[PDB]
Amino acid sequence: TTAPKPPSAFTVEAQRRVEAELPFADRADFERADRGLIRRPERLLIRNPDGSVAWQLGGYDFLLDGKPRDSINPSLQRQALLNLKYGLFEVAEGIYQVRGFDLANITFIRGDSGWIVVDTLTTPATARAAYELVSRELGERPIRTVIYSHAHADHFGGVRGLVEPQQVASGAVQIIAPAGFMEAAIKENVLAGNAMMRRATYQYGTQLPKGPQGQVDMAIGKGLARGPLSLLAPTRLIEGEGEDLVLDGVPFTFQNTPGTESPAEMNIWLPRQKALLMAENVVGTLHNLYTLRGAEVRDALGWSKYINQALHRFGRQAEVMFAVHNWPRWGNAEIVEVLEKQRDLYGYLHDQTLHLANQGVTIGQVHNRLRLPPSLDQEWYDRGYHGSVSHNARAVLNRYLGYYDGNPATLDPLSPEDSAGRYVEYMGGAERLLEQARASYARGEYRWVVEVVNRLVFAEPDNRAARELQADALEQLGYQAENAGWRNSYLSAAYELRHGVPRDQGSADALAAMDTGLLFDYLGVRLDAGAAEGKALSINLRLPDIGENYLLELKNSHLNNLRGVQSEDAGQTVSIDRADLNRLLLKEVSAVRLVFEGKLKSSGNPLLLGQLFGMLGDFDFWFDIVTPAA
Amino acid sequence: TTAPKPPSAFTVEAQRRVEAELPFADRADFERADRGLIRRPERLLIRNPDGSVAWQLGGYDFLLDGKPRDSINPSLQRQALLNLKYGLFEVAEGIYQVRGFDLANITFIRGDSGWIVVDTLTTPATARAAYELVSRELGERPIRTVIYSHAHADHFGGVRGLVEPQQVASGAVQIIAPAGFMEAAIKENVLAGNAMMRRATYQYGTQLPKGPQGQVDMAIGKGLARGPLSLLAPTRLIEGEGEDLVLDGVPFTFQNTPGTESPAEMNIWLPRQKALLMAENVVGTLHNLYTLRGAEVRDALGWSKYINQALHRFGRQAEVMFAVHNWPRWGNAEIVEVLEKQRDLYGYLHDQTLHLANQGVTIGQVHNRLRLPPSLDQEWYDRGYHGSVSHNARAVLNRYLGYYDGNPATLDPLSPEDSAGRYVEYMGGAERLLEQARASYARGEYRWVVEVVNRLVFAEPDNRAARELQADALEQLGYQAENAGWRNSYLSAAYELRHGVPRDQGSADALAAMDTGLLFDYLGVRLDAGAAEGKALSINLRLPDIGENYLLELKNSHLNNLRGVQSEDAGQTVSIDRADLNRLLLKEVSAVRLVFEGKLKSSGNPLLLGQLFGMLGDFDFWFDIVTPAA
């Protein structure tokens, strides 16, 4: 059947073990999550300018229940309720935080005559709503200082919700960020963008229903708010290892931690109330060293060090700690213990992975073998909600040693769809394979069943019996999975196997921020080698509104973009502004018109730039994952 | 049987396709390789001070034939037999190179009154041997400038063979290197060293005999010379993007290319002779973006543009090009097209991998589908000798998106040894799996056979029939394998599962160079969680011969070093020098003498440091790869 099955007896008993060993007599996190609530809006609906849904939490009503459901992991079910502790919160003399608007939090710190703000959610609407609440609840104050904690969309993404560019241009509003902020913001999210996003749909569960048979939590969040993406340039940068500043008469102490959530990130220390804002490093869960989305593997060793530096600099004198995702801690003894265990967590994760790896434990091997120590294992903020011990362990191994396990058997393997054919024949034809796979499904051997049947799934891309067996084999792992990404992934996969892929379905300031070089590297990725092959050309560009001068070269099916140098024996010369070249590529205007406006001047052959853009292709967003290409 | 089998009818057929499509007509590389020979010693051996072999070439006599052997790839033979053109070579007025004394080359540049040297090779023996040859061939001149091209052992490894610390300390000898050299030099082959080196045994073929049914070449050189490792610190660093300098009345122009072969690396331009030294960027082959030994993936994008910048600054005026591994090129028209294609090669790899990846292609597919264009595919320096299109392509995908293919079937798989049993049972189990694999082996489905039989190999670790068959299947791929690492690996694997794993079997300068932080991280890696756990301590180090102050902490089975800080309610304080803490760790001396000698000061409980070092474990070098743990 094409509909979610109930949990198996093995699945329920697995949920019993999670509740058995792992200690949840201690619900103190709830006690800390509520506490200091100012006022909780009873209905939450946030709306976009175009009219669509940005954010809504009535889809999660079913968790208010306070009753265990064995289609969800009871540890994840905790973290789900604790992220339903939404509303506006006291921390501080002068320190308040809005929460449950959006995946991230937003911090409001009262300057003697205005607001100082950390981070802007994910999209303008969520930021608007938060600012209107803060304004309505504790008096209307103008925002004067905006702090990007680090380069990630959920934190900078709703900046024009709060402020207009003219307010920054007048010098009446500050924007502060850790050095290298712009660099980090983009460069990731770009050249492998289509793949990451399409992969992400599994991780987040954009497909998913919002029920006990579906999405429940995003672990640092309920989920990601969904609208446009804003970004404004940092006026000030926190260079070096950190800086102590005064802004609207409030003392701040920034501490750079490059390499942790992000390549540019910093922790904030507020002295006259002894509050420590630990950024995305220290949060209510084990974080991703390697997001399943697709990313460069993050440095867990430097992550641990920078927590340890943060402990000795601040932890002693800090009596309240809080973060950009999730919810604060009070009493310095609790804070110190947390920071110690968080430091040692990522450290243990790094050191013991490499310890095992050095005894020849493979990238296949390790996740099954590496198990946490009781002291770390047995606190909540160390549970694999966002990150996971498993996939973080093989991320670390992958970072140091790459993908290749060591065995040459796995060195030049066939594509799984080409080897799928054989794997089926060998077994016993298609249907013998089925009933022993289905026998091992009755055993409770689920994470075997997924690996094996997946081979038949690729051999037989339309075999209903294979697809919907694999589906409820996967979806059962999704039920008992503690990790949110894992759950959402297993369920999004099953949903797609059963009901097919969606047949039926960027942001300006990101592209404006995007460096000319990087943009043209993305154009070179987009290039079609079929058109390419054999041809060769040389285009000069002049971009006067940024003042940068590029040289484009095409030989051997590859495009090459070179700043600020250009040969005069080239094929064509082009003169065009940056902001309108964006407009051209964003597909808001045509080129011919740009010519008649008097801002596209060309000498030499006029046709090369035309052909080149003809050689550029595009990528189908909805490509298959759990099946071969249809 | 347990001996190498001759090639199959499919292997020979494959070797004759290699003859067919590749342009073997043009053997120009041979007359370039021989070009400028001063004298070729008839009989080379190089010895160590201890008395062992450092380097020979009498093992490769079989390739001086010129007659095709289908147990080897004909393109690999070609590259092998080109790398046998050893001896001392002229390049231009005042530019000389020694090749075939080690994996690398060593360059000698005529100053008006002394030598200027680039690279010092694997070990002191080989370097000294080269300097003696240069002396008695063209006159004994003193070396007074040493240039490390980049941070890699095959280039800096034999520095002590040329110069003493005497001569550097006086200021009579210069050591020049690109900025970030040393740090680059170490951190990489450290924390995952044991793993990296044991894996390397396959890649290099340290076990392998040296025949047509064994090791043939190392692609960028015959193999690696094998003695001690020497390292002397850089006196001056090339900072920024580059620097133009004069040494002994000779003009140089250094161009930094950080992120290629190495995190710290530079191309050298000699304007008088008009020659271009391109370091490890442009060589006689496609270079690794990911060494199979195990490393973080190299940035191919930056590689391509730093080649393009070199082309435009030098290539126009360049008249002879040469490199640190292999052999030069003459005539600027050739140079330019080489640099064009080399640039466009790495750029095509990077771009079209991501093109395919953004179009939905997984890590398990890309290598099969990505195929080079004719212009690049057909030239010798673009052939996958050292690197390979296949494993480089997956490395790029792995860099941007990590190991996870996308399918949750592959998310939480079993360790192959745990799933091995079931793969056997339910193909029908051990012997009926065997004959159908044999049936596949009779077709020439070799790279299938290796994957499937390997499951049985892990299920049944001592099953001769499985391991011998797998060996024959593996080695026959190694016969056809154009890539040298691939050949050496496939063969090394086959040898190991045939004859078992060898039952019967560090550097000072490196360890003195190794940062105190990094060292203590490696200690933290070496920690045994078993002993550790539950325990907690706080050691407090003073290191006066370097003047650095460290705090060691142990909680939650994890060790945390921290410089420039130390708490005065710690557990135990210690004062000890670097140099003798090295001699302690290296096991040159015991701690007790080091006390009585008068260099070990201890305050507070003095037992903690002793206990901590007790908690430290160690790693067996010879672990199993192609079998499970015996």
Ligand SMILES: [Zn+2]
């Ligand atoms: Zn976030």
